[PDB]
């Protein structure tokens, strides 16, 4: 799912 | 060439508007086979003259009467007859032959019946089968996305050839029915079989072919009616909504939308907003208008059980999602080969829109951690391409396909941030807005983005650029990758050249500009912001800003909003790292985390000794903050799985303990002994990172704490004592301090497990043992589907090898058992690919080079399938490990060494 994680 | 063998659709006839009717068979028929029948009707202007129907078709039979279409004139314009239709399967076309020509201005309507599977494979109009007690669930939804409405009704499938729909939905009468727009009144019984319902929707606005969608299911929902009228609501499976996990999603959406509404200086642009909660969504989340899909753990939360990180997850990408109704669904970009301006300014924006929602959180900073340094790994390469592909370049499906990836979602984000920080925010939103107005239920490409910004440039006399708008982005869209600045403190020079990671790599790719970009600079000196600088298109400049006296120093991208990285002489980084070891709040937290980033970079490019990149981390005993720890966290794991079996092991854990003990006593105070977490997200994170790093490298003070909970749990099975957050690292720490009465209590509750996030944190504290017998067991249970999923089976396996004591088992596991290959790469995937990477990461010797390739010796039949590249990429990988291990072994040892006291 787009978001982008760190 | 013919037409129907060219890729892009002709430009003669453009769609006006569509009726489409589709019916999903949610019983499957005699042979297993689930089908959907539909019908539609699609309105068209003929452009220019032409005796060909040229419309997009994937995987459908046709029943219409006569020939697969029937054709006709609008109003009094008569129509030629039909020649014939044929189906060209692989540029994916219906072809409707004319015995004369269509004529400009005139309107015709083409009507078609049609039938295709209603398969589950996560394409068109699809099944999706889930549980729900005993009982076995199917329901039908879409994923048109990106070259798939086709799949589901002939319709003109590009992006720019926008329409109005009218959708209609025959249904079982005790199943709801949705789409973009609201239906138009209660459902009415379909007069042939009165156990169907018809549901009819509003007309859509003009809007492009990929981004409806319709739903047939038993889902629930919760909701809330903003002031404007705008009806909010988050569907979900029955029992998720009876449970409340859609409590969460709901709270914030209301707020998102107003953030966006304003930021956009545009009204929402529809009735309502649906956002739906699917189990199992392999493409995680799609933006259709007015009614966006979700896979679950994206979408829902359960307080009880979520940690924080999940929290974070469901508002980012809500707010992602939601970025996209304006923004992608309003403004359209016009072809496939400007996808990274979408999904990058989605990318960005996210954490602006769940920064409204969620203020105290500091949403913003995680763009650093979470795309610009998880990108540059990926461009600081060789093989990396540009932001920008030429149009004509894109045409194929797998074309478009490829679109889809770190670089356009990732350095689009960043890049794009880099501009609006430039610009400044208020003269971005001014351009954005001008934009939004302009090109409202249109298609744009990046060109006019830019030409609105400079507008709002040219508008104003405070910001001063060195070049227009469209100039500096060309350096940073046109060519791939990024510089390295390079500062002399003494001197003041300043340099730029195209980074790479590895300072051997031959780059092939040739740039226009000759890698040479236009750099925005920020800078910080002794703690005081700096005039702005730029770089201009050259390899050495000079400037009093970036020149120092000893005592003082100088810090350049504050927050790491310019797409770079940078490096200084010796005596400036040791200036930073004394400011650092003596008040380090004067460095803005973001550039603590930089110094850390860039430097292990700079290191692997030998750029600098690695010594200076450990040097860097010394400051870490006095931080209290996430990112930092965060960072060296990040740029350490690689020298943990290299050294985790050697000398160099030992001294290394003990820096981590040293450096590491204060945060974790820190938060023992504040969280008052465990029992209360700290308020905000990133000290939360913080305290996360802190246990995690405590007991991984053995302090005992965190060893105790989770033998003690973990201990305390088991006496008490059904009141768990461990706060979400600190679950991954209790469970594993505590199963590795214990035996077989530790596992086969996790094992219990692994098999009991309700919500997909708990048994993801128990499968893997399961390989956490340290019982050589436990973790062969464990890997024994792996293939069977009654204890492990498929789905999890790689993920599980991986997990036992990231335990040195697993790390031969695993290996030996999976050489032994390949031949699970003639068994999972026929009806199902099952990602051999994860495996092979998983299981050969650490590899760093001859030796283990020597058995990767004896291993691979075995091409004789079997082969590999889905990670043949997979296993080539592990051998080049080895070789690389090999070489770096020799190069830094004995520095790196000495190092820890000196350190560790
Ligand atoms: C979908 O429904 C809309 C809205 O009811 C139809 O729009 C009408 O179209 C005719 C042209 O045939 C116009 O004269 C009317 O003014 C329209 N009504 C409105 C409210 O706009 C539209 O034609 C339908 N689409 C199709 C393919 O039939
Ligand atoms: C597309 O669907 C609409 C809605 O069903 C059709 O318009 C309706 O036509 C029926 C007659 O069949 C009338 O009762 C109404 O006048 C229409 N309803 C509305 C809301 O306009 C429309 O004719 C269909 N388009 C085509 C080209 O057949
Ligand atoms: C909707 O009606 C359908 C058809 O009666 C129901 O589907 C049946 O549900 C029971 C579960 O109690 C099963 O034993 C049958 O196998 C189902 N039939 C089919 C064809 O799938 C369904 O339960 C009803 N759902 C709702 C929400 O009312
Ligand atoms: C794709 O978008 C362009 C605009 O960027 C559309 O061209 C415009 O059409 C509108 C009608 O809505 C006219 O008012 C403008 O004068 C046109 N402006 C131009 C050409 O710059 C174009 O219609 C769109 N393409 C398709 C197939 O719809
Ligand atoms: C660098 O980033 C920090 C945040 O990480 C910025 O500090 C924020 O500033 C805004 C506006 O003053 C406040 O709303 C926040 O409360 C601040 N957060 C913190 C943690 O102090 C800082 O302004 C940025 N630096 C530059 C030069 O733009
Ligand atoms: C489409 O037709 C082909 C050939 O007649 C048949 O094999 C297939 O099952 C049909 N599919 C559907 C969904 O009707
Ligand atoms: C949703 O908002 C309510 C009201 O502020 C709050 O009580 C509740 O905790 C929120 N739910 C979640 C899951 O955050
Ligand atoms: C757009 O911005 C202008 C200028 O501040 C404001 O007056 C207007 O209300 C805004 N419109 C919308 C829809 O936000
Ligand atoms: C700095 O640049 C100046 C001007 O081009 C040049 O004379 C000098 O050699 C450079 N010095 C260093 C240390 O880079
Ligand atoms: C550290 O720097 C900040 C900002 O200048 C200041 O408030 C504080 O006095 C300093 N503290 C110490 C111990 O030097
Ligand atoms: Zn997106």
Redesign the interface.
């Known amino acids: ?6 | 060439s013919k037409p129907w063998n060219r890729y892009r659709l002709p430009t003669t006839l453009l769609p006006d508007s569509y009726n489409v009717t589709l019916r999903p068979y949610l019983t499957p028929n005699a042979d297993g086979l689930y089908i959907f029948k539909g019908k539609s009707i699609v309105r068209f202007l003929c452009q220019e003259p032409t005796d060909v129907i040229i419309i997009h078709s994937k995987k459908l039979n046709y029943t219409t009467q006569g020939h697969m279409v029937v054709l006709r004139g609008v109003g009094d314009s008569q129509v030629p007859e039909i020649d014939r239709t044929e189906l060209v399967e692989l540029t994916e076309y219906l072809v409707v032959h004319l015995k004369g020509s269509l004529q400009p201005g005139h309107m015709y309507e083409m009507e078609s019946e049609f039938q295709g599977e209603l398969a589950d494979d996560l394409a068109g109009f699809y099944r999706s089968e889930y549980m729900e007690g005993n009982v076995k669930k199917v329901l039908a939804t879409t994923q048109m996305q990106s070259t798939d409405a086709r799949k589901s009704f002939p319709c003109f499938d590009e992006p720019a050839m926008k329409a109005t729909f009218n959708i209609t939905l025959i249904h079982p009468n005790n199943l709801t029915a949705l789409s973009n727009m609201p239906p138009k009144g209660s459902s009415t019984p379909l007069a042939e079989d009165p156990n169907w319902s018809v549901t009819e929707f509003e007309t859509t606005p003009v809007m492009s072919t990929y981004l409806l969608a319709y739903i047939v299911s038993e889902f629930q929902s919760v909701n809330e009616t903003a002031q404007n009228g705008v009806l909010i609501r988050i569907w979900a499976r029955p029992n998720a909504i009876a449970e409340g996990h859609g409590m969460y999603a709901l709270n914030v959406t209301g707020p998102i939308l107003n953030f966006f509404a304003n930021h956009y200086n545009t009204s929402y642009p529809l009735p309502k907003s649906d956002q739906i909660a699917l189990p199992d969504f392999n493409a995680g989340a799609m933006e259709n208008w007015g009614l966006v899909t979700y896979r679950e753990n994206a979408l829902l939360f359960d307080p009880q059980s979520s940690s924080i990180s999940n929290k974070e997850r469901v508002v980012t990408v809500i707010a992602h999602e939601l970025a996209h109704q304006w923004f992608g669904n309003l403004v359209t970009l016009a072809w496939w080969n400007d996808l990274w301006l979408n999904e990058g300014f989605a990318s960005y924006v996210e954490y602006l829109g769940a920064d409204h929602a969620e203020p105290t959180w500091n949403l913003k900073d995680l763009i650093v951690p979470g795309d610009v340094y998880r990108v540059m790994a990926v461009d600081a390469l060789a093989s990396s391409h540009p932001l920008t592909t030429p149009a004509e370049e894109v045409n194929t499906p797998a074309q478009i396909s490829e679109m889809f990836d770190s670089i356009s979602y990732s350095k689009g984000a960043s890049v794009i941030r880099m501009l609006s920080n430039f610009l400044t925010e208020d003269l971005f939103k001014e351009g954005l807005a001008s934009y939004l107005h302009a090109f409202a239920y249109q298609n744009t490409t990046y060109l006019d983005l830019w030409e609105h910004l400079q507008k709002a440039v040219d508008a104003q006399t405070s910001i001063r650029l060195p070049d227009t708008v469209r100039a500096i982005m060309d350096r940073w869209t046109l060519q791939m990758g990024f510089p390295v600045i390079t500062v002399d403190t003494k001197t003041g020079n300043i340099s730029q050249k195209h980074f790479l990671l590895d300072s051997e790599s031959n780059v092939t790719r040739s740039s226009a500009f000759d890698y040479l970009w236009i750099v925005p600079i920020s800078s910080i000196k002794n703690g005081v912001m700096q005039d702005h600088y730029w770089l201009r298109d050259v390899s050495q400049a000079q400037n009093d800003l970036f020149k120092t006296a000893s005592d003082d120093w100088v810090l350049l991208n504050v927050n790491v909003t310019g797409y770079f990285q940078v490096n200084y002489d010796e005596d400036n980084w040791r200036m930073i790292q004394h400011q650092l070891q003596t008040n380090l709040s004067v460095i803005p937290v973001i550039n603590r985390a930089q110094v850390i980033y860039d430097s292990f970079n700079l290191a692997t490019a030998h750029m600098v000794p690695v010594t200076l990149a450990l040097d860097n981390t010394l400051f870490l005993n006095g931080e209290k903050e996430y990112m930092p720890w965060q960072a060296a966290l990040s740029s350490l794991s690689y020298f943990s799985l290299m050294f985790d079996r050697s000398e160099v092991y030992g001294p290394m854990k003990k820096y981590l303990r040293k450096q590491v003990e204060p945060l974790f006593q820190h938060f023992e105070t504040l969280t008052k002994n465990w029992t209360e977490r700290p308020e905000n997200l990133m000290d939360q994170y913080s305290e996360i990172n802190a246990i995690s790093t405590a007991c991984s490298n053995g302090l005992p003070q965190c060893e105790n704490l989770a033998k003690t909970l973990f201990d305390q749990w088991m006496s008490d099975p059904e009141n768990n004592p461990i706060h979400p957050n600190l679950r991954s690292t209790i469970y594993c720490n505590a199963i590795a301090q214990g035996g077989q009465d530790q596992w086969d209590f996790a094992w219990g509750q692994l098999q009991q497990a309700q919500l997909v996030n708990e048994a993801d944190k128990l499968r893997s504290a399961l390989a956490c043992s340290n019982e050589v017998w436990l973790l062969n067991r464990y890997l024994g249970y792996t293939l069977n589907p009654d204890l492990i999923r498929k789905q999890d089976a790689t993920s599980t396996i991986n997990s036992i090898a990231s335990n040195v004591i697993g790390q031969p088992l695993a290996w030996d596991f999976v050489q032994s058992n390949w031949k699970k290959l003639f068994q999972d790469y026929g009806g199902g995937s099952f990602s051999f690919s994860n495996l092979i990477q998983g299981v050969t990461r650490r590899f760093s010797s001859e030796f283990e080079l020597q058995q990767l390739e004896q291993f691979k010796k075995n091409n004789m039949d079997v082969g590999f399938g889905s990670g043949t590249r997979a296993l080539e990429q592990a051998l080049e990988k080895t070789k690389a490990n090999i070489k770096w291990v020799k190069e830094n072994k004995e520095v790196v040892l000495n190092w820890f060494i000196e350190h560790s006291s």
């Open positions: 799912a787009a978001a982008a994680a760190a």
